Amino acid sequence: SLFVNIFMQAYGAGQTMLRWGVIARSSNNIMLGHVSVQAELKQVTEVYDLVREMGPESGLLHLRQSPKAGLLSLANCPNF
Amino acid sequence: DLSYKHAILKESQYTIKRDVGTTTAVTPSSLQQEITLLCGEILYAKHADYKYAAEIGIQYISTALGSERVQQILRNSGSEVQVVLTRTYSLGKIKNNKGEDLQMLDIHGVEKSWVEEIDKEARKTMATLLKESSGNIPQNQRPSAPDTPIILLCVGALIFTKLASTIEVGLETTVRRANRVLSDALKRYPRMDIPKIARSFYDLFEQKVYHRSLFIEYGKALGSSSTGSKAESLFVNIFMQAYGAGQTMLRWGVIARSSNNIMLGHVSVQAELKQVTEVYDLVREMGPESGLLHLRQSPKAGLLSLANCPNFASVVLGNASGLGIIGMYRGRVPNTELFSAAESYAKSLKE
Amino acid sequence: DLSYKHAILKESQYTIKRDVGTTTAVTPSSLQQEITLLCGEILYAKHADYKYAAEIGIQYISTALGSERVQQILRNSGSEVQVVLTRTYSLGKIKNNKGEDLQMLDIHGVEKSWVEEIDKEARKTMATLLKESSGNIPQNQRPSAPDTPIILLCVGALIFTKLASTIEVGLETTVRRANRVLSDALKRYPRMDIPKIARSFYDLFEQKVYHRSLFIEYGKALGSSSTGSKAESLFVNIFMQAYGAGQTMLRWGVIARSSNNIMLGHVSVQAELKQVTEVYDLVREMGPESGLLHLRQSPKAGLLSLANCPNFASVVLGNASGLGIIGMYRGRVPNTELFSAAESYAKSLKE
Amino acid sequence: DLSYKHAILKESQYTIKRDVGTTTAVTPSSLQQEITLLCGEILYAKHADYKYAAEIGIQYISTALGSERVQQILRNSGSEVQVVLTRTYSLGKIKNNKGEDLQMLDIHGVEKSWVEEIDKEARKTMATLLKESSGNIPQNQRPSAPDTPIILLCVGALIFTKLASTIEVGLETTVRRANRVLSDALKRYPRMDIPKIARSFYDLFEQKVYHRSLFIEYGKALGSSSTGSKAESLFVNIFMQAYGAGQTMLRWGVIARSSNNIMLGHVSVQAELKQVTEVYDLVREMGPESGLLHLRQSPKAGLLSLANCPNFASVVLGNASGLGIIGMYRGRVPNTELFSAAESYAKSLKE
Amino acid sequence: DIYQLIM
Amino acid sequence: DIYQLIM
RNA sequence: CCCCCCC
RNA sequence: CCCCCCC
RNA sequence: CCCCCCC
RNA sequence: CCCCCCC
């Protein structure tokens, strides 16, 4: 049970910005409404749509060291 | 009319034959190790001539895909180039450390003297470096590292991202971006001449257009793999950065719609949104291969042009300029007044 | 009308291109050490020629900001000057203490002979000083001190504070204030020719107006830093002292309002308080960049002029004169009677 | 009724075509240096003929804005003039100091003989001056100074400020104000014939009305620049001084309201304040471009006329006369009694 | 010697 | 001995 | 004709 | 290029 | 018809 | 035209 607990703690590894962006939405940060971020929420939503499309295996992409990992990068939305 | 033109060009019963009498070189996958060394020997020495570095990168792509599969790829690109197979030949009386004859690659179209001089210069450079320091050369600073072909191909992919630009802008961009992106490689290999390798790759992509297709297949074959190295992930990242090349006005128009530029509502643009929508419908009809149209240098490219909607183009360029993302883009602005008004509104919105 | 004029000048869709065929010099940040030495060698020797000292200070600013970022700054100032990059060159057969070739800076537009003579005179001066006293030269009296470029730039900032004045008044003010403010530096470096360095900086700010912008960016980049030296704090202090330059009548009118000069209530001034308020509204509309309008030599400057309200100007100058703060200000007093009455009231109030 | 007339004139679906068969000259920006020299050679010699000096100033404006952008400007002003491009031609067997053929400008509509005689007279004058004194000619006294086109255009802007006046008053004002404002230039260039250059500019603004628009764009393009020279700031200052030209009664009525002239309360004026307010509402509706209506010589100008309110006009002129600001203004005073009473009250208030 | 002046 | 000063 | 920025 | 915290 | 001063 | 002092 301890092994499985740590193994789940390893899940979203390499994608902490997605989790932290979900937090920032749940935190109702008003600066998300700044126009510079507003110009990028469409591609942000595309990244999260990609996570939904990949499904449960998207969390293991960096743990597996999949070349496909990096499509889940929010690095092209600097203001968000 | 645009859908009709696309249906005219697409629905053709006759294929075109080109490069009928020509030949090109590939390397069998079983020589991957032997090509890897070569791809690492262009990297760690300072060479007078970097003419065939892009060819060696293509040879590595051939070993990674397979000679027969590469022949199939070049046939499907629409070229009749006759693949020739790389042959290992003994240098001569020279012998290696194992007591066997030193076998070197013989690539078609590459003078053997170039390969000999690259190998000799690399060997001399490593001899000097070991004379300076003893036992200070780890695996990652050696030419035999498995990722050196990927480093060469990453310089090639950097020059690939700028294939719709000019040679000067592409070279400057490749050097500037390679100083940052390929920084670990430049630390491991402090004397790889990125400008000369980039010029070699630009040349190769000019004369041998079908190799562009080969390059693309590598990316497709490389992003479909379950695992890979860090250098391969970097290659795929740059290869995706090359995607919408030659069609930045479509992306910038999507931006101008997402920016809610009020000058899109000007009646002159409103008279053109129907053909703008037809262009985007054409993109949807073409599908995922529409982004590679300019990279492949498809004749079909140019149906994706918004140049017949000058006011929409002016408003899109003005919105991009106001947001500050226009950079040094050299697209022409037909309507100056719409450009100015759109830029003023976009600056006001951004502030 | 004044808001309308500001909206006319501000809302322009066309930028102006100047200095298209010209070039200017920058130094890559990696040569900061090498420029620091030079900025310290103009300081501790007596030189026949101080022509390019301001250029060396700008070179240090370039190293502190970055060559590409400095090119971006000069582009955004509205100039097409083509940045040129400083190159280290070996002097010749001369060798340094480390056994390597003595590398010296090669700056564009600066004759190498000037750099050679500055370096040679500085070396001769230190040789003489060590001949006089042995082991008596600490780090703070050496040219290689990290703050010597900042000392040079502080003399430059002193001349920058007086850029709306004349050359004679600016030079006198710079010498007088540098005898006090840069006193620790003048003790460390007893033979830096402040008048000649100040004249060099005044020249540089005359020919190369875009460098003013660069100077300003340095201040902006320097006051935003978490830490710094004492010399950098001094530079920022003088740079803020330069803020409202060319607009002392606005500050003095705010004073005359805070002084409750009863002659502000004279009907002739009362007929002008509406346009006075429009001028201050324009300052509020422009915002924090309104103070740098005359330092940048913006054509937009002059919209902030109160010269069309002669009676308010006379009352403001009279109130300033009564309080004794008018000094030797040479602004013209249109209404002499209002000036006299305002000065009498302000003297009575101060006593 | 006035808003209805403005809506009638403004909301027109048909544009007017003029100057269809005509042509005008521009100079590509790449010849800016070559035009600068010419703009400096009209300045430092005494010429028998100054016919085309204003044309050379417009050529400099064209180089500063761009030939294609100037064509767009002239099209948007409502003129079908066909831009012609300046061509550099070799003089002949004559060679310059560099050993190349002496290239001189060829401007459309300007006889080449005029350019040859201007250049020859300037060369002869400088030869004589160097014969008198050796090595006594700094850069600022040479025709190749970058600001000489701006000096020529500042004389042009002085004549531009008086375009709603007559030719005699405009010439006298230009000479009188240029003796003071362009004093540094007159010290550098002691033999520029300001009356003849001003007459040339007045002519140019008479025949080629569209060039007025071009002139205005230059000001707009020049006040929007981040940096500039002192001469450019002077040009923009005079260009703003030209703003409300042809509408001094509106400004003087705003003054008479700010002067609290009690005769504004006379019932005859009170019967007209409603249409006066409509005129000022029209100014607000037109916006920042309302000030340039008479400078552009817009047919729409004249809707801003207060000539149908004779008693308000009389009271405004009387208030201006009492304050002493009426000067030699030649506007007609319909009501003499209201004028006298307003002038008496304004004098009493000012005293 | 009139056409080689520096200007 | 002028070019080897420490500075 | 098209294309042209940045990452 | 990506990535980078804590549990 | 308009416009018209000064800076 | 503007600007102009002192720190």
Our measurement of the distance from residue C245's CA atom to the centroid of its chain's CA atoms, rounded to an integer in Å, reads 10
**For chain F, how long is the longest CA-to-CA vector?**
14
Dihedrals phi, psi of C94, to nearest 5 degrees: -65, 140
- Tokens 């629905």 belong to B11
Sign of CA dihedral B103, B109, B113, B119: negative
Question: Which of C309, C317, C305, C304 is CA-nearest to residue C346?
Answer: C317
Which residues, including other chains, have CB under 8 Å from residue C87's CB and lie 6 or more apart? C105, C106
CA distance D174 to D242: 12
Dihedrals phi, psi of C160, to nearest 5 degrees: -70, -35
Tokens of C184: 């620790």
Residues, CB < 7 Å to strand I: C 307-308; D 161-162, 164-166, 169-170, 172-173, 176-177, 180-181, 241-242, 246-249, 251-252, 294, 301-302, 305-308, 325-332
How far does the CA of residue F1 sit from the closest CA of chain C (Å)? 9
Helix (H) or strand (E) holding B83: strand B82-85
Range 240-279 of D in CB contact (< 8 A) with B:
none
Q: At what angle do helices A16-26 and A41-54 cross, to 10 degrees?
A: 120
Q: With beta carbons less than 8 A apart as the criterion, state whether D264 and D257 touch.
A: yes
Interface test with B, best of A57, A65, A77 (most B CBs within 10 A): A65
Question: Which of D243, D271, D276, D241 is CA-nearest to residue D257?
Answer: D276
How far does the CA of residue C141 sit from the closest CA of chain F (Å)? 9
**Of all protein residues, which has its CA closest to the C1' atom of H5?**
A16
Tokens of A39: 């110009």
CA A18 to C1' H4 (Å) is: 14
Helix (H) or strand (E) holding D329: none
The three-state secondary structure class of B82 is strand
Q: Which residues of D touch C5 (CB under 8 A)?
A: 240, 243, 288
Residue B250 Cβ < 7 Å to strand H: no
Beta bridge mates, D106: D87
Residue D177 Cβ < 7 Å to strand J: yes
A 10 A CB-CB count for D45 gives 23
Resolution in A: 4.0
Question: Which of B345, B281, B280, B284 is CA-nearest to residue B314?
Answer: B345
Tokens of A61: 């992409």
Helix (H) or strand (E) holding C12: none
CB burial of residue B84 (10 Å; 0-12, 13-18, 19+): middle
b/e per residue C183-195 (b: at least 16 CB within 10 A) = eebbebbeebbbe
How far does the CA of residue B251 sit from the closest CA of chain C (Å)? 24
* CB pair distance less than 8 Å for F2 and C127: yes
- CA-based R_g, chain E, Å: 5
CA distance D95 to D102: 5
CA distance B51 to B200: 6
Q: Which residues of F touch C126 (CB under 8 A)?
A: 5, 7
**Of all protein residues, which has its CA closest to the C1' atom of G7?**
A76
Lookup: nucleotide whose C1' is closest to B327 CA: G5
**Of all protein residues, which has its CA closest to the C1' atom of H2?**
A70
Which residues, including other chains, have CB under 8 Å from residue C265's CB and lie 6 or more apart? none
Q: Which residues of D touch C217 (CB under 8 A)?
A: none
CA distance D245 to D159: 12
Strand H positions within 7 A of protein Cβ atoms: 1-7
Tokens of C258: 């805070």
How far does the CA of residue E7 sit from the closest CA of chain D (Å)? 6
* CB pair distance less than 8 Å for B350 and A65: no
CB nearest to C16's CB, from D225, D258, D287: D225
Dihedrals phi, psi of B23, to nearest 5 degrees: -135, 155
Dihedrals phi, psi of A4, to nearest 5 degrees: -65, -35
Q: DSSP for C76-105?
A: HTT---EEEE-EEEEEEEEE-TTSSEEEEE
Interface test with C, best of D184, D225, D247 (most C CBs within 10 A): D225
Nearest CA in chain B to D76: B337
Q: Which residues of B touch C13 (CB under 8 A)?
A: 336-337, 339-341, 343-344
CA distance B212 to B77: 9
CA distance D225 to C76: 10
* CB pair distance less than 8 Å for D69 and B337: no
Question: Which of B74, B62, B36 is CA-nearest to residue B218?
Answer: B62
* CB pair distance less than 8 Å for B337 and C13: yes
Residue C276 Cβ < 7 Å to strand J: no
Beta bridge mates, C23: C82
Q: Which residues of B touch A68 (CB under 8 A)?
A: 223
Helix (H) or strand (E) holding D277: helix D273-286
Residue type, D190: P
Tokens of D155: 């004389």
CA distance B54 to B221: 19
Residue type, C193: D
Q: With beta carbons less than 8 A apart as the criterion, state whether B315 and B269 touch.
A: yes
CA distance B237 to B175: 17
Dihedrals phi, psi of B201, to nearest 5 degrees: -70, -40
Lookup: nucleotide whose C1' is closest to D242 CA: I7
CA A6 to C1' H3 (Å) is: 20
Q: Which residues of F touch C94 (CB under 8 A)?
A: 3
Tokens of B66: 């397979």
Our measurement of the distance from residue B219's CA atom to the centroid of its chain's CA atoms, rounded to an integer in Å, reads 10
Tell me, yes or no, if D72 comes closer than 8 A to chain B by beta carbon: yes
Question: Which of C207, C201, C213, C50 is CA-nearest to residue C118?
Answer: C50
Q: With beta carbons less than 8 A apart as the criterion, state whether B213 and B289 touch.
A: no
Q: With beta carbons less than 8 A apart as the criterion, state whether C292 and C284 touch.
A: no
Neighbours of chain D (3+ CB pairs under 8 A): B, C, E
Dihedrals phi, psi of D137, to nearest 5 degrees: -110, 100
**Of all protein residues, which has its CA closest to the C1' atom of J1?**
D237
CA distance B103 to B88: 6
Residue type, D222: L
CA distance B79 to B180: 36
Q: With beta carbons less than 8 A apart as the criterion, state whether C197 and C155 touch.
A: yes
CB burial of residue B305 (10 Å; 0-12, 13-18, 19+): middle
Tokens of B36: 């890897």
Tell me, yes or no, if D69 comes closer than 8 A to chain C by beta carbon: yes
Q: DSSP for B208-265?
A: -HHHHHHHHHHHHHHHT-S---HHHHHHHHHHHHTTTTT-HHHHHHHHHHHTT-GGGG
* CB pair distance less than 8 Å for A64 and B226: yes
Question: Which of B91, B147, B149 is CA-nearest to residue B123?
Answer: B91
* CB pair distance less than 8 Å for D123 and E6: no
CA C50 to C1' J5 (Å) is: 29
- CA-based R_g, chain B, Å: 24
Q: Could you give the C-alpha distances from D339 to B284, D54, D328, in angstroms and in order? A: 76, 42, 15
CA E5 to C1' G5 (Å) is: 45
b/e per residue B241-266 (b: at least 16 CB within 10 A) = bbebbbbbbbebbebbbebebebbeb
Which residues, including other chains, have CB under 8 Å from residue B86's CB and lie 6 or more apart? B25, B26, B27, B28, B31, B35, B59, B105, B106, B107, B108
Are F and D neighbours with ≥3 CB pairs closer than 8 A? Answer: no
Q: With beta carbons less than 8 A apart as the criterion, state whether C264 and C315 touch.
A: yes
Neighbours of chain A (3+ CB pairs under 8 A): B
In degrees to the nearest 10, what's the CA dihedral of D102, D105, D111, D113?
-20
CA C19 to C1' G7 (Å) is: 30
Residue B162 Cβ < 7 Å to strand G: yes
Q: Which residues of B touch D69 (CB under 8 A)?
A: 336
The three-state secondary structure class of A69 is coil
